[PDB]
């Protein structure tokens, strides 16, 4: 409602680096809200694209941004009789960043990994990794939960059970309020998906620079289901956390499997033990129900109402039998005796191939009226196809039917504006949360300050 776009602030990264692919705020020790922006294609030290993370300080003028000095160099270690080998090449270090208020958990899902024992190897694959970094103390810490070392001759002899080599862990990462780190590995157990929950304080404590294979010993991965619905589910493709089971100590994950049950897609809710609480099947196939999950109380009832993006949902019209516009669901968590799972609201896009719903951002109380207000984005919506960000306030029974205000992209066509948003973080202390939109196609990030 109040995200006046006349005077933005544009943060720009190296040209050709997708600067803005994934972003999140980071409150420093002084309360100086600095923007973390992930650029999965920034050139490294070998003239190769190996990601990079740009901790943007909040400047009312935007511009360039100093990067976070991370490890972009391939590391090899002859531990035991195995050639432990990491290939930090095309790893996309920044494909999904997140900050636990002093730690920048910037992940690299496509970071390969290979171990050799004199004839054979683990079939080098993107096990992914998540480089952690405190901007104040500057102590790096890696965390790759899926760096196995079982030879490929054993996986083929176990019907690929516990085949967490393809994890791409850090594909979608969220850090709980208590301090855990919840990676989304939508390749774990052979593209069936998993999660890794290792507390942040227990990653710094148990990280020795130099050894590649190590188990945190406090982590907890998901389980390899054998239900043919789960196969090729890309489970954990986009995860979020909330409170869906009463115990305020534990937290509940909102894992979204977009290709679930033969492309139908379902967003599962599950407690800290990965035991399924809820499961929200999608309407129609090939719509990525669950490509982008979000969780916020959109009706001020104390319940964590989740939202599920369906970027490729094909609505029904009178001209096109099914014209692909996208759809954002709203599963209000019932405060009564019934259960979550009935879609309370169905927000649908307007522009064909706009992928309306590929990135939802719980801005929180944007206009200070009690109820939180998400902001959906269509990376190719609008009347021209340069992107669009729509702000849906939530009145009392869920969200508003019509978007309060749209944010037409100020970047040229192809910028994919809206591919990554973040909200509910006041970046200059107007008292109001300020939405920042990641236009990775134009290698920039736009900051929309919410003037009251």
């Amino acid at each position, epitope marked *: 409602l109040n995200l006046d776009p006349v005077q933005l602030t544009f943060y720009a990264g190296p040209n050709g680096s997708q600067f803005g692919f994934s972003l999140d705020f980071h409150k420093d020790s002084h309360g100086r809200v600095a923007i973390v922006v992930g650029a999965p294609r920034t050139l490294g030290p070998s003239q190769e694209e190996t990601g990079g993370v740009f901790l943007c300080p909040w400047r009312a003028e935007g511009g360039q941004c100093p990067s976070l000095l991370f490890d972009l160099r391939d590391e090899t270690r002859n531990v035991g009789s195995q050639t432990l080998q990491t290939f930090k090449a095309r790893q996309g270090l920044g494909a999904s960043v997140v900050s636990w208020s002093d730690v920048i958990v910037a992940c690299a899902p496509w970071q390969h990994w290979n171990v050799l024992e004199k004839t054979e190897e683990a079939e080098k694959t993107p096990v992914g990794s998540c480089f952690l970094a405190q901007p104040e103390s500057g102590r790096r810490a890696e965390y790759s939960p899926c760096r196995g070392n079982t030879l490929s001759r054993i996986y083929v002899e176990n019907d690929f059970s516990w085949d967490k080599r393809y994890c791409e862990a850090g594909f979608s990462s969220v850090v709980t309020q208590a301090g855990e780190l919840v990676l989304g590995a939508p390749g774990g157990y052979y593209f069936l998906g998993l999660l890794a929950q290792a507390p942040v304080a227990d990653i710094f404590s148990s990280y020795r620079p130099g050894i590649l294979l190590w188990h945190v010993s406090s982590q907890s991965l998901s389980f390899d289901s054998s239900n043919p619905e789960y196969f090729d589910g890309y489970w954990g493709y986009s995860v979020a956390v909330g409170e*869906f*089971d*009463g115990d305020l100590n534990t937290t509940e994950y909102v894992v979204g499997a977009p290709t679930w049950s033969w492309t139908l897609g379902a967003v599962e809710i599950l407690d800290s033990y990965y035991q*399924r*609480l*809820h*499961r929200l099947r999608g309407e129609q196939m090939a719509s990525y129900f669950g490509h982008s999950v979000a969780v916020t109380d959109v009706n*001020g*009832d*104390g319940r964590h109402d989740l939202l599920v993006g369906a970027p490729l949902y094909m609505e029904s019209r009178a001209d096109r039998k099914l014209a692909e516009v996208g759809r954002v669901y709203l599963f209000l968590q*019932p*405060r*009564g*005796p*019934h*259960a979550l*799972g009935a879609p309370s609201l169905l927000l649908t896009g307007t522009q064909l191939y706009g992928r309306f719903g590929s990135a939802i951002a719980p801005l929180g109380d944007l206009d200070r009226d009690g109820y939180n207000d998400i902001a959906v984005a269509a990376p190719y919506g609008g009347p021209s196809g340069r992107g669009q960000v729509l702000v849906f306030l939530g009145q009392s029974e869920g969200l508003r039917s019509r978007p309060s205000q749209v944010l037409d992209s100020p970047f040229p066509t192809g910028s994919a504006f809206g591919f990554s948003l973040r909200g509910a973080v006041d970046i200059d202390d107007n008292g109001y949360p300020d939405l920042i939109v990641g236009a990775y196609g134009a290698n920039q990030v736009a900051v929309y300050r919410a003037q009251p």
Partner: antibody
């Protein structure tokens, strides 16, 4: 420790209403709803109506929807169900349960009702 | 609505033993199914919820192994304090309908 300590046994002439108060202690009141369940003589219990402490929600069973005017006292952490037009067939025990994430955790006592 | 049925309305076995309270759902629900222990003279409390989640103030003997429509409560080491009427509640779709109630008897 939260106890939903309810009222005592009542007796009502037929055709006259009756009020069943359910006090809540501990447990800041507006965290969860305050449902209601009627247990008949055959010890088969079916629930009556929901109500939302923040704002009167009054979600009913569509079988008791008429004669279960559910009320609430947010300030005094109390909850009512004000049964109306009572008949001889609706003499039962009326629990004052609490919903909390779609369960009925905590019920408390149970108000014996009698119609003569 | 959804009609919940407990076939055996009166189950019986010796103390210190395991018994399984059955419960069926007319319409296929998910894994939403609570369990309530009601002993003599009221004082009904909540057992395992969501078909297996022990409540805060309940022993660790109770456990449920239901999925789909066929739900159960397999109580282990039946003590003297576990004789009660056990009601299964569906809590998926309004209105949540309880079960028929299984009377327990120590033998």
């Amino acid at each position: 420790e939260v106890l939903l300590q309810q009222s005592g046994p009542e007796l009502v002439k037929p055709g006259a209403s009756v009020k069943i108060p359910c006090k809540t202690s501990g447990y800041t009141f507006t965290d969860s709803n305050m449902d209601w369940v009627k247990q008949s003589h055959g010890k088969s219990l079916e629930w009556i109506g929901d109500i939302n402490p923040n704002n009167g929600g009054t979600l009913y069973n569509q079988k008791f929807k008429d004669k279960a005017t559910l009320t609430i006292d947010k300030s005094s952490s109390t909850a009512y169900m004000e049964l109306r037009t009572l008949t001889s067939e609706d003499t039962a025990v009326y629990y004052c349960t609490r919903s909390y994430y779609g369960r009925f955790d905590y019920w408390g006592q149970g108000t014996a009702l009698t119609v003569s | 609505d959804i009609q919940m049925t407990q076939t055996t309305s009166s189950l019986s076995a010796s103390l210190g033993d395991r018994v399984t309270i059955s419960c069926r759902a007319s319409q296929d629900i998910s894994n939403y199914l609570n369990w309530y222990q009601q002993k003599s003279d009221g004082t009904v409390k909540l057992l395992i919820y969501y078909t297996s989640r022990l409540h805060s103030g309940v022993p660790s003997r109770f456990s449920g192994s239901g999925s789909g429509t066929d739900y159960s409560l397999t109580i282990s080491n039946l003590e003297q304090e576990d004789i009660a009427t056990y009601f299964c509640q569906q809590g998926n779709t309004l209105p949540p309908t309880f079960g028929g109630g299984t009377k327990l008897e120590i033998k």
